[PDB]
RNA sequence: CCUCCU
RNA sequence: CGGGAAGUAGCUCAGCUUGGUAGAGCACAUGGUUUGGGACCAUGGGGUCGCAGGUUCGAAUCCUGUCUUCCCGACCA
RNA sequence: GGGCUACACACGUGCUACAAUGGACAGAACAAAGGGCAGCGAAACCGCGAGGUUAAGCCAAUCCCACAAAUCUGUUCUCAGUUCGGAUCGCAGUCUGCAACUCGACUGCGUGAAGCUGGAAUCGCUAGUAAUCGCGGAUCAGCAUGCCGCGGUGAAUACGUUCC
RNA sequence: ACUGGGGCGGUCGCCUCCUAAAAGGUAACGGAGGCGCCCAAAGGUUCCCUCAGAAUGGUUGGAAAUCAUUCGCAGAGUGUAA
C-alpha cells in the first residue's frame, strides 16, 4: 500500500542521507506491530475476552491470540492460566495497512486529539502508543460496542536510537506533539 | 495466514467528505469517514 | 459586575499612591483599608496590603489578579475545620 | 452520525441532538440550524450528506468538548494559582458564589457524613 | 416505670 | 519445672476443624416517640483477628516462636 | 475595615422537583384588590435579553404600574434520569448604589448535580374550604421561596363518638 | 517396649539432610524436615523451545495482570520434604 511504497522510495533514501550510514542496510524499518488489549475484567465477567476479541479481530484484521496469565496474582483475583487479554502480531502489508489506516483515519478520530507523545520510545527505538477508545477505528461500528476499551500498539523497529526511530516515525505522517 | 480463522480482509477505500481518498485493506468495502489527516486541525495547522 | 458606562472603580487615595510609585521605579508596601478597589494594569508588581479586618495582609500583584478586587486576595475569615 | 468526535442519538430530532454536544444548548442548536438552513424536525438519521457538511463547518467555528473544557479547567486553575477567594472556594469544595453554608451546600460538597451530636 | 434540692 | 487451653469491635461471644465473606448480642451514634427521661420504633457506623516469623497467588483460619491470662500435674521414697 | 452571610454536622419552617392530568412551542381568552410625586412612567426607538435613551399622561373611578396565570384550542415530544428536573460552576452582561471581594438582584450563553413520589413517624383542612394558578402591598436605593392582602379554577368526605 | 531408676510426658514403620572424622557403615529421649500419595497426563515418543528478576516505554492498570524492547548461568522450574 502507499506508505510501503512511500518507505521504499522516500523515506528510505532520506534516512540514508539524514543519519549518514555505510549501508542501506543500516536504515531502520518498521519490524512489526503488535497490538495488545489487556483484559482484567476477564476475571469476573467471562465473556470480557470474546468481546474483546471481536474488536480486535476486526480492528487488525487477524484472528488474535489470547494471553493468558504468567503467574497467579492475589490483588488482582487473578490465577495461572486464567485468559486476561488478547495480543495479535501485525507484519509486511496487514502492518503497513494497519499503520496507514491508524494514522490517516483512527487518530484524528480521538477525541480532543493533539498529537501523540514525544516522550513514549523505550530508550532503544521502539515506539508505544494507548488508545483509550475502540470506537476511532473504522471498523468498529458505534452501536455493536457495549463495554469501551482500549489497546496498546507498539511499533518496533530497527532504529538503535530513539531519534533515529522518532525521524522515521515523523516520515511517516504519524502526528508528534508540537 | 492459516485458512478459515481469520476474517475477510481485502480492498476498502476510505473517503474524507472533506476530499482525501486513499485505498487501504480493511474488512468494510466502502469505509467513509468525516475526518483525516488532511481535515484534521493538528495536521493542518490552525 | 460594575456596569461598562461607568467603567471600573478604584479609591482616589489608592490610585494616587500607586501612580505617585510609578511616576518613579519605587516599590513600597501601599498599606491600605481599600477592599473594594479594582487592581489595574498598572498595579502590577507593588506589594499592597490589603486590611482583611485586623490586619494588613500583603499582597503581592500579578497580570493574572488584574480585574479582580483587592478584597479578593486577603481573606476575612479563619477557617481551619471542626474537629 | 459523530459531529465534533460525538455520536449524537440518531433516533432524536436534530434541535434536541445536537444539545448532546458539549457547548451547545436549545438556544445554539436553534441558531446553527438556522444558518445551515436544516428544518427542526428532522431526525438525526434521515439527514443528508449535505445537511450534515453544513451543520459540522457551522460548529467546528464554535468553541465546544475538549476545547471548551480546556478553557473552563484553566479559568478554575487560575483562580487557584492566584489564591482569589474563589479558588479557596474551588479547592476547598464549597460555594463560590456567596451561597451560605450553615445549610445546603450539598453539592459542592457532596452526601452528608454525620458526626455525634452534643 | 420514673419525674433532683431549696 | 512438665502438659494443656484460650487471646477476634467498648464488653461478652461465634467463625478456626474444610484458606478466598470479618460476624452476633449488648453497647455506641443519628432520627422518631415523650413535657422530659426510661422503655419502644426506624436508620447507621465501628475491628483486620495478641505480637513476630513462616507456608501459600492469597492466612482470623495451616506451621513455628514469643508474650499475656487461665487450667491440670509434680508421684515411690 | 471586618463580622452578624463562618460550616464536620443536627432540627424547625418553606420553595422547586421527581414528569405525559406532563414538557416545549403557537393561537384565543376570563380577574380582584392594591400602589404612584420626584413618585408611577405609557408610546416610540435601540438591545437576543436584563435593560437603555427619550418622553406622553397622571398628586389619579381620568394617566401609569399592568403583562393576569392556571384554563381552552392546535402542533411536537412518546416514558428516557429524558425535550423531566434546574442545583452547581465557567464566561459575558444589566441595574441600583460613593462602593456589590467578603456579601445584591436580575439577564444571555455554556454547564446540566441530586431527584423515579420519600423509614420510623408526623401536619393542615368540613366549602368557595382544601388543592392549585397568578396579582398587589408594607419595609425598601437595591434585595422576599418570608409576611400581609387580592381574585381565578375548584374537590373529596363526615357512618359515627369507641379510642388518641 | 524404649526410658540416664520407674511412673507420667514423648516415641515405635518408611524417606531426605546434618551430626558422620573427604569409600561404605556408624550411636544418643542429638539437630532439622517429610511420607502412608498424586498424575489417564504430571506416562511413552517425535518435533520445537528457554527460565527468575530488573530497567524503559504503554489505555483502563496499581508495587504487581497482559504487550514491547534490552540486560539476564539460571538468581527459575522440576506434582510433593530434602
Ligand atoms: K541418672
Ligand atoms: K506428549
Ligand atoms: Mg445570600
Ligand atoms: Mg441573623
Ligand atoms: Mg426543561
Ligand atoms: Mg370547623
Ligand atoms: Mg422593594
Ligand atoms: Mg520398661
Ligand atoms: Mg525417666
Ligand atoms: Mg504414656
Ligand atoms: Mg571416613
Ligand atoms: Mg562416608
Ligand atoms: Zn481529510
Same mark, same amino acid.
Given at each position: =500500500?502507499?506508505?510501503?511504497?512511500?518507505?521504499?522510495?522516500?523515506?528510505?533514501?532520506?534516512?540514508?542521507? %539524514?543519519?549518514?550510514? *555505510?549501508?542501506?542496510?543500516?536504515?531502520?524499518?518498521?519490524?512489526?506491530?503488535?497490538?495488545?488489549?489487556?483484559?482484567?475484567?476477564?476475571?469476573?465477567?467471562?465473556?470480557?475476552?470474546?468481546?474483546?476479541?471481536?474488536?480486535?479481530?476486526?480492528?487488525?484484521?487477524?484472528?488474535?491470540?489470547?494471553?493468558?496469565?504468567?503467574?497467579?496474582?492475589?490483588?488482582?483475583?487473578?490465577?495461572?492460566?486464567?485468559?486476561?487479554?488478547?495480543?495479535?502480531?501485525?507484519?509486511?502489508?496487514?502492518?503497513?495497512?494497519?499503520?496507514?489506516?491508524?494514522?490517516?483515519?483512527?487518530?484524528?478520530?480521538?477525541?480532543?486529539?493533539?498529537?501523540?507523545?514525544?516522550?513514549?520510545? *523505550?530508550?532503544?527505538?521502539?515506539?508505544?502508543?494507548?488508545?483509550?477508545?475502540?470506537?476511532?477505528?473504522?471498523?468498529?461500528?458505534?452501536?455493536? &460496542?457495549?463495554?469501551?476499551?482500549?489497546?496498546?500498539?507498539?511499533?518496533?523497529? @530497527?532504529?538503535? @536510537?530513539?531519534?533515529?526511530?522518532? #525521524?522515521?516515525?515523523?516520515?511517516?505522517?504519524?502526528?508528534?506533539?508540537? | 495466514? $492459516?485458512?478459515?480463522?481469520?476474517?475477510?480482509?481485502? $480492498?476498502?477505500?476510505?473517503?474524507?467528505?472533506?476530499?482525501?481518498?486513499?485505498? @487501504?485493506?480493511?474488512?468494510?468495502?466502502? &469505509?467513509?469517514?468525516?475526518?483525516?489527516?488532511?481535515?484534521?486541525?493538528?495536521?493542518?495547522?490552525? | 459586575?460594575?456596569?461598562?458606562?461607568?467603567?471600573?472603580?478604584? *479609591?482616589?487615595?489608592?490610585?494616587?499612591?500607586? #501612580?505617585?510609585?510609578?511616576?518613579?521605579?519605587?516599590?513600597? &508596601?501601599?498599606?491600605?483599608?481599600?477592599?473594594?478597589?479594582?487592581?489595574?494594569?498598572?498595579?502590577?508588581?507593588?506589594?499592597?496590603?490589603?486590611?482583611?479586618?485586623?490586619?494588613?495582609?500583603?499582597?503581592?500583584?500579578?497580570?493574572?489578579?488584574? +480585574?479582580?478586587?483587592?478584597?479578593?486576595?486577603?481573606?476575612?475569615?479563619?477557617?481551619?475545620?471542626?474537629? | 452520525?459523530?459531529?465534533?468526535?460525538?455520536?449524537?442519538?440518531?433516533? $432524536? !430530532?436534530?434541535?434536541?441532538?445536537?444539545?448532546?454536544?458539549?457547548?451547545?444548548?436549545?438556544?445554539?442548536?436553534?441558531?446553527?440550524?438556522?444558518?445551515?438552513?436544516?428544518? #427542526?424536525? @428532522?431526525?438525526?438519521?434521515?439527514?443528508?450528506?449535505?445537511?450534515?457538511? %453544513?451543520?459540522?463547518?457551522?460548529?467546528?467555528?464554535?468553541?465546544? #468538548?475538549?476545547?471548551?473544557?480546556?478553557?473552563?479547567?484553566?479559568?478554575?486553575?487560575?483562580?487557584?494559582?492566584?489564591?482569589?477567594?474563589?479558588?479557596?472556594?474551588?479547592?476547598? +469544595?464549597?460555594?463560590?458564589? +456567596?451561597? =451560605?453554608?450553615?445549610?445546603?451546600? !450539598?453539592?459542592?460538597? +457532596?452526601?452528608?457524613?454525620?458526626?455525634?451530636?452534643?
Amino acid at each position: =500500500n502507499r506508505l510501503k511504497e512511500k518507505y521504499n522510495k522516500e523515506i528510505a533514501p532520506a534516512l540514508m542521507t %539524514k543519519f549518514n550510514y *555505510d549501508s542501506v542496510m543500516q536504515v531502520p524499518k518498521i519490524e512489526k506491530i503488535v497490538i495488545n488489549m489487556g483484559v482484567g475484567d476477564a476475571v469476573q465477567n467471562a465473556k470480557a475476552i470474546d468481546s474483546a476479541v471481536e474488536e480486535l479481530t476486526f480492528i487488525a484484521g487477524q484472528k488474535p491470540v489470547v494471553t493468558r496469565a504468567k503467574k497467579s496474582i492475589a490483588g488482582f483475583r487473578l490465577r495461572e492460566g486464567m485468559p486476561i487479554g488478547a495480543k495479535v502480531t501485525l507484519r509486511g502489508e496487514r502492518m503497513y495497512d494497519f499503520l496507514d489506516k491508524l494514522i490517516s483515519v483512527s487518530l484524528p478520530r480521538v477525541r480532543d486529539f493533539r498529537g501523540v507523545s514525544k516522550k513514549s520510545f *523505550d530508550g532503544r527505538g521502539n515506539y508505544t502508543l494507548g488508545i483509550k477508545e475502540q470506537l476511532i477505528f473504522p471498523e468498529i461500528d458505534y452501536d455493536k &460496542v457495549t463495554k469501551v476499551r482500549g489497546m496498546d500498539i507498539v511499533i518496533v523497529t @530497527t532504529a538503535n @536510537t530513539d531519534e533515529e526511530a522518532r #525521524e522515521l516515525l515523523t516520515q511517516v505522517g504519524m502526528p508528534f506533539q508540537k | 495466514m $492459516k485458512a478459515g480463522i481469520h476474517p475477510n480482509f481485502k $480492498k476498502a477505500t476510505v473517503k474524507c467528505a472533506c476530499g482525501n481518498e486513499f485505498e @487501504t485493506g480493511s474488512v468494510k468495502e466502502e &469505509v467513509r469517514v468525516e475526518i483525516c489527516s488532511e481535515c484534521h486541525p493538528f495536521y493542518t495547522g490552525r | 459586575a460594575r456596569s461598562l458606562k461607568k467603567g471600573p472603580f478604584v *479609591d482616589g487615595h489608592l490610585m494616587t499612591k500607586i #501612580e505617585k510609585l510609578n511616576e518613579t521605579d519605587k516599590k513600597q &508596601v501601599v498599606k491600605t483599608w481599600s477592599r473594594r478597589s479594582t487592581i489595574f494594569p498598572q498595579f502590577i508588581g507593588h506589594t499592597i496590603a490589603v486590611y482583611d479586618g485586623r490586619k494588613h495582609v500583603p499582597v503581592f500583584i500579578s497580570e493574572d489578579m488584574v +480585574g479582580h478586587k483587592l478584597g479578593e486576595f486577603a481573606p476575612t475569615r479563619t477557617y481551619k475545620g471542626h474537629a | 452520525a459523530r459531529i465534533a468526535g460525538v455520536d449524537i442519538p440518531r433516533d $432524536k !430530532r436534530v434541535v434536541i441532538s445536537l444539545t448532546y454536544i458539549f457547548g451547545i444548548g436549545r438556544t445554539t442548536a436553534q441558531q446553527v440550524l438556522k444558518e445551515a438552513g436544516v428544518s #427542526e424536525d @428532522t431526525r438525526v438519521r434521515d439527514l443528508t450528506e449535505e445537511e450534515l457538511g %453544513k451543520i459540522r463547518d457551522i460548529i467546528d467555528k464554535l468553541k465546544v #468538548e475538549g476545547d471548551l473544557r480546556r478553557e473552563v479547567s484553566l479559568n478554575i486553575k487560575r483562580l487557584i494559582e492566584i489564591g482569589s477567594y474563589r479558588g479557596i472556594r474551588h479547592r476547598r +469544595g464549597l460555594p463560590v458564589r +456567596g451561597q =451560605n453554608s450553615k445549610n445546603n451546600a !450539598r453539592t459542592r460538597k +457532596g452526601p452528608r457524613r454525620t458526626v455525634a451530636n452534643k
